[PDB]
């Protein structure tokens, strides 16, 4: 029995906690998409802070399409009646009602249609009034509902998401950026959602070169990463460092890095245990808290019901019927930890999958200590002959060298000493929540005590996630 030894100083912040708990997916029914469960309250309890809109039925299709935001491209682009906002309005309102911001992805109806825009001038006008609808109340719209506007989704994923040329993609990006900034310079615009971020190409170097040479705004560079071929929660930090270096190389030192998709698996035939995945995503969140990632979108916090490809994506962490499990439990405990504002020092975790993170709320009355015990499986600790991952859709991408020395320490439990509780030595409450092979994030036990220090110990086998919550008792 190997027992990890953790210590937290609860009385002094080391710095600000960074709110990286973004996600994508459909949280509740909307007109025309009413078959999905209502899980919006779970997003609220998880303290989701950012929602990518791409998986909604909220596409700006480049041909005529009833479900598109502009369904008839012959219609008057100045008339609100020409726009189809109803379902998107519902999802925007749902997202704002839980206090989350929106990353609105401007994209065609992938995969049914990936053609570029036929009429760039009209495309630009239509993008601008979509923005005005969600930012300036245009056409019975919202005020300041969408802070981030993304153009693109995996243009380098073969021709499966974009069938135009790179030049056509770049001009479309510039039109969208012009329209967003014309509505409100304070809005953030970016792209292109690189699918293969360690691969040179027209949508990495060629995209950065274009926005530089043509002086196009780029508030964030967006990209994706999945753990399919590593199962290593460290990957997101590793990739972000490399992306940061390439973006800086083009002079874009103020541009943020936005992780538009991240998941243990992104291959639609991937197989995994619920509890392994839960521990992975908690460890990944902890590791990327110290990284070049500035904003992150977990893929995907719903049932995986995909109304574009018309299947159930296994990356959807909820059960088909909306019910909960270890993944949804870990998702909530992570978000609650990331919602603290003052990060606290925790010492004794490691970089081989026993990840720990501590923080306290702004009012000082709640300490949260998040612990994931995750083990990279043995078969993923073998170095590859060649650091390229090949998969069927036949495609290939560059992957980082595997961390062959990152085998789990194999802890079976932990003891945790929290000192200097900030409200003093009076009454406090200790509550523990667990997501593992037997639990879905619910509370396991609790007690009340006194003193400015508290010691907590538990068995916590690999593939388990635990949240320790310490509160002042009134």
Residue numbers in the entry: 4 to 396, 404 to 484
Extract from the study:
A putative open reading frame of 1458 bp (cmgh1), encoding a protein of 485 aa (CmGH1) with a theoretical molecular weight of 53.48 kDa and pI of 4.66, was identified from the whole-genome of strain C. marinus E4A9T. According to the phylogenetic tree, the protein CmGH1 belongs to the GH39 family. Here, we present the characterizations and crystal structure of CmGH1, which showed β-glucosidase activity, instead of β-xylosidase activity, to provide a structural basis for the development, and utilization of the marine sourced β-glucosidase. Therefore, CmGH1 was evaluated for saccharification potential with different substrates, which turned out that CmGH1 showed β-glucosidase activity when using p-nitrophenyl-β-D-glucopyranoside (p-NPG) and cellobiose as substrates.
The crystal structure of CmGH1 was solved with a 1.8 Å resolution. Diffraction dataset was integrated into the monoclinic space group P21 with two molecules per asymmetric unit. The first four residues at the N-terminal region and the residues from Val396 to Thr403 were invisible in chain A but were refined unambiguously in the electron-density map of chain B. Therefore, we will discuss the Chain B structure only. Structural superimposition showed that CmGH1 shared a similar architecture with other GH39 family β-xylosidases, despite that PslG and GH39wh2 only shared 17% and 13% identities with CmGH1. The groove distances among residues Phe114 and Tyr312, Pro271 and Leu163 of CmGH1 were 6.6 Å and 15.0 Å, respectively, whereas the corresponding distances in the groove of GH39wh2 were 19.3 Å and 22.4 Å (Tyr210 and Glu415, Asn251, and Asn370), and those in XynB were 5.4 Å and 14.6 Å (Tyr116 and Arg324, Tyr282 and Phe166). Therefore, CmGH1 might be a new exoglycosidase when comparing with GH39wh2 and XynB. The active sites of XynB include the conserved Glu160 and nucleophile Glu277, whereas the corresponding residues in CmGH1 were Gln157 and Tyr264. However, Y264E and Q157E/Y264E mutants abolished the enzymatic activities of CmGH1, which suggested that Tyr264 could contribute a vital role in the enzyme activity. For example, the β-hairpin motif of CmGH1 extended from the catalytically active pocket and held onto one end, which was not reported in GH39 family. However, the β-hairpin motif of CmGH1 was far away from the nearby small α-helix, indicating that there was no interaction between them and the β-hairpin motif adopted a closed conformation, which might be related to its substrate recognition.
